[PDB]
Structure formats: structure tokens, C-alpha cells
Design a protein around this ligand. Structure first.
Ligand SMILES: [Cl-]
Lengths: 274, 284
């Protein structure tokens, strides 16, 4: 089964698992299917993908998941349900998306990343090319020339950057896409092998724990909030993405942050701080 | 004429052209499982019915005309990432790699249970009243709450339901990770969500570069947030204002603001007064 069919199989699984009820009319409205094709899709799911996981409930005039029901196409993350609904309605321009009634999603609409920059940066990552561009940083906020060999575009959840060799500092660094003036241009200067970006290829395990300033009842709640399996979250990450992962989890890194236990219920275990 | 699946192929053509500057027929064929004949028919359709002569053959595929404008998508990079992320199954990963040269930092949620979503969502749709078991940082022992939920909210970090709390007679935010077992529908008359004043009242927050940064530094913050007058104006519901400020990593306190390079973006001092008390909007 190819993309079209699988996306419908995925929608059947998600409606049943997260809503607890699947009616053909929802599938019809989502995909513009006939009632016949929608019914046949539910049959294919209940026959080929998740055998007898769905039970017709004539009362609720719909299908419900059996108590045995486990997803087979999706992970059991609620992220899967939000991603399905968001793909049916694009509102990436909105501060607050409303993919369906009774659901609001807080977004960060990004206007600052130009297509002409992405086009060049992505081509240079694919070609392992070198770029000449105009940049500004907090350290050096006057526009200046930079020569970079990019390997990977990165979305942090807040900002876009490219991981690139800087030919002046001879270091692998993170370059903000919002801070590139005009169109980068390809130059015939030898690029550095991305396999030499140690921080990028080296993995570390971050251990996040409930804030020690919380009482033990409050700590049990933090374990629940983060679905911690054994009183911690262990997150394997590339060294060069570790800082961004911690900010994505809103983890306390600093002493004054960890002191505000209500604001920062999650801290990085000290050994890892080093 | 075009249903979801055809509209997805059209958007994909447009986003590859606009963001990558090149559309290779093999990319289409692999993404949607098309023959070269179906792939070329899709390009012909976008080029005929959607964006007349926007694409030209050249590379085993097509390039945007110099006058190329997107017709199906806003010029937000979010649309490109959304399209790519829809094609692969990576909602579980710390770091998604939706294509070989793009890494996305994600927050996979491990705490929201489907039996809770099933009951809360149905109750939102039905305007029902629920009894449930809840714990807060204030009262971290399990206790009963009686709620009339109206909206599920994802903040970018956590999931909550906006609901009327029948004991406190106040609309509050209940974290979905803090419900134990399955909520039960009860006979109590639900409360009209039209009475949630904080949900219905819109406000406008003003975000500025951190005044501790020098003039040159402040100009880059303006470039980062596409705000060339020096102010970013955020219209938002009062009950979502704190979540918006957090999603933007904005300083709201003096102590926060004092750290310029951690908080380059700050809330205007005169707007602090318009904000609710965060940890009074949270259920007990
Ligand atoms: Cl790529």
C-alpha cells in the first residue's frame, strides 16, 4: 500500500485510538471518499493491518477500539494525533491553530527564513559545497563576510540554523538563517569533510530528574508529567544538539533557574552539567 | 475538483519548487508511490490548473520561473517542514530527520493517555460535566475535581484542558498528565463556555529587543523576529497569553530580562499589568 492508502489507514487508527469512535462520515469529509470506499478502508484496516482491533457499536453508530487495542501504524504519542489533524488544515501562519473545534495549538510562525537562502544552503549541504555569505552575530553585530561548508539544516523548535564549518575560525558552528543577508553564493574553495565535526557525530546521554527542591509528592508528579520510566528521563543526543534539547524540554541549566522549582520542575543531573 | 490526496501532491510540487528551487520527478514518485507517467501528469496539472506556466523543464526535472509566486502555501518555512514531516513516521524521535540534511528537535509526549483524551474530547463536544482524579503542585495528593471542559490546548510543551471547575466556580487549565484513571460523565448541569471571560477577551502583547543589548545587537533581534519598527505585536486570548510568551522564550520578569543574551526578546514593561497570574490560572 502506497502513501494515499496508508494515510487513510493511519487516520482510521488515530480516530479509533485517540477519539474512541470512528464513523465513515469523518473519513468521507477528510479524504472526499464515497461511503463505500470509507467502509472498505475500515475493513482493510480491521483485516490486513490490525486484525479485529475494531468492533462495530450499533448504539454509537460507529466503530470503537476493543480493550486489547494497540496501535500498529503509529507510536502511542499524542503528537501523532495533532500531526494528523494539522496536515488536513494548514495554519502554520497562525499564533493559535484550531485544526478542529475544541482544539487549540500554540505555534511559533516563522517569517524570517527566506526561500533564496534555504535553496542555496540545502544545495550546498547536498553537494558538500562552500558558500560565501554576509552574516552578523551578537559577538560581531556588524555585517561581515563568512565562508562556510554546511552539512545539516537544524530546526530547534524556536529557530532555524545551519551546522557548518567556518573557514576563518576553523571550527564547526551554528549559523542562524534569519541572520544571512541576501543570497549565499557557491565559491570554488575546498569544503571540509563533515565526518570531522566531533561534537555533531559524538553522542551523550542527558539524564533529566525532578528538581531536588520539590518535596517527594511533587517529584512523583514530575515523573508522571514526563512519563519517566524509573524516576528519570535518559535522552541520548548529539553533543552539538544537547543545549537545544534541554531548552526544548524547558530544563533548568543555571543555578538561579534550579532555585525556582515551580518554574523549573526538570533539571539536568549535575554529573552531566560537566 | 481536487480532494485531500491530490491537493497534497500539488502542495508538495509547490513547496519543492519554492524552498528547494528544483522539482525532480523521481522525488514525487518516491514520496507518493507514483509511476513516472502519474508523476509527470501531477506536474502538468499544477503547471496548468494551479500556477499556469510557473515551472519549466531543464536536471531530471523542473525549475520555478523568475516570476514564481506560491498559490497554495504562505511563505513560512513551517509549511516545508510540515510537508516533509507528514511523509515519514518520526513523532517519537528526540531528533527527527525528515530528509537527510534536515534535523528537527522534537518533544515526544509520553504522559497523555488516550482514555483521558477520549472522555475529555467527547465532554467538550457534548458540553458534559466530568468527575476525575487530579493532583497539582499545590495539592499533590489525588483528589476529585468536577469539570465542564470546552477546549484541549497544546502549548508546544504540554497538553491541558480549559474547563469550568465546579467547586472553585472558576475556569482553569487542567494538565492532562495529572488526571488519574478515566474521567466519568456525571448528571450535574454543565456551565456555558460563553462565561469564560479570560478565554474570550483578546489582548495585544508588545515584545521588544532586550534594552540591555547595544543598538547593533537590537537591530539583529528585529531581523530575527521580522519586526522592523522595533515592536512585535501579538494579539492573543488572555487565557493563552502566558503560553504564547513561553513559546517565544520571552522575558516577563526583571531577573529574566537582566540576562540579555538568554532573553534577547522581552515583554514591554507596561504590558505586565494586562497578564493574569499564571499559577492562579492552573487548577489545584
Ligand atoms: Cl536533504
Amino acid at each position: 500500500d502506497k502513501h494515499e492508502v496508508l494515510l487513510r489507514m493511519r487516520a482510521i487508527e488515530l480516530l479509533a485510538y485517540w477519539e474512541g469512535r470512528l464513523v465513515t462520515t469523518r473519513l468521507m469529509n477528510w479524504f472526499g471518499l464515497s461511503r463505500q470506499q470509507a467502509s472498505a478502508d475500515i475493513k482493510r484496516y480491521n483485516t490486513l493491518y490490525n486484525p479485529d482491533a475494531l468492533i462495530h457499536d450499533p448504539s454509537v453508530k460507529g466503530y470503537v477500539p476493543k480493550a486489547s487495542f494497540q496501535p500498529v501504524l503509529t507510536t502511542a504519542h499524542i503528537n501523532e494525533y495533532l500531526n494528523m489533524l494539522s496536515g488536513l488544515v494548514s495554519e502554520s501562519h497562525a499564533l493559535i491553530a484550531m485544526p478542529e473545534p475544541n482544539l487549540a495549538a500554540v505555534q511559533l510562525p516563522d517569517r524570517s527564513v527566506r526561500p533564496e537562502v534555504i535553496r542555496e544552503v540545502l544545495r550546498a549541504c547536498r553537494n558538500q559545497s562552500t558558500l560565501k555569505m554576509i552574516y552578523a552575530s551578537m559577538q560581531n553585530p556588524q555585517w561581515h563576510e563568512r565562508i562556510i561548508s554546511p552539512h545539516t539544516l537544524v530546526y530547534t523548535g524556536f529557530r532555524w540554523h545551519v551546522r557548518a564549518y567556518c573557514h576563518q575560525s576553523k571550527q564547526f558552528k551554528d549559523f542562524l538563517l534569519s541572520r544571512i543577508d541576501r543570497t549565499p553564493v557557491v565559491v570554488a574553495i575546498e569544503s571540509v569533510d563533515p565526518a570531522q565535526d566531533q561534537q555533531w557525530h559524538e553522542e551523550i546521554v542527558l539524564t533529566l530528574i525532578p528538581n531536588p527542591k520539590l518535596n517527594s509528592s511533587q517529584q512523583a508528579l514530575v515523573e508522571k508529567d514526563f512519563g519517566m520510566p524509573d524516576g528519570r528521563l535518559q535522552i541520548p543526543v548529539k553533543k552539538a544538539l544537547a543545549h537545544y534539547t534541554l531548552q526544548r524540554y524547558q530544563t533548568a541549566i543555571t543555578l538561579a533557574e534550579a532555585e525556582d522549582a515551580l518554574k523549573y520542575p526538570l533539571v539536568l543531573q549535575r554529573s552531566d552539567i560537566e
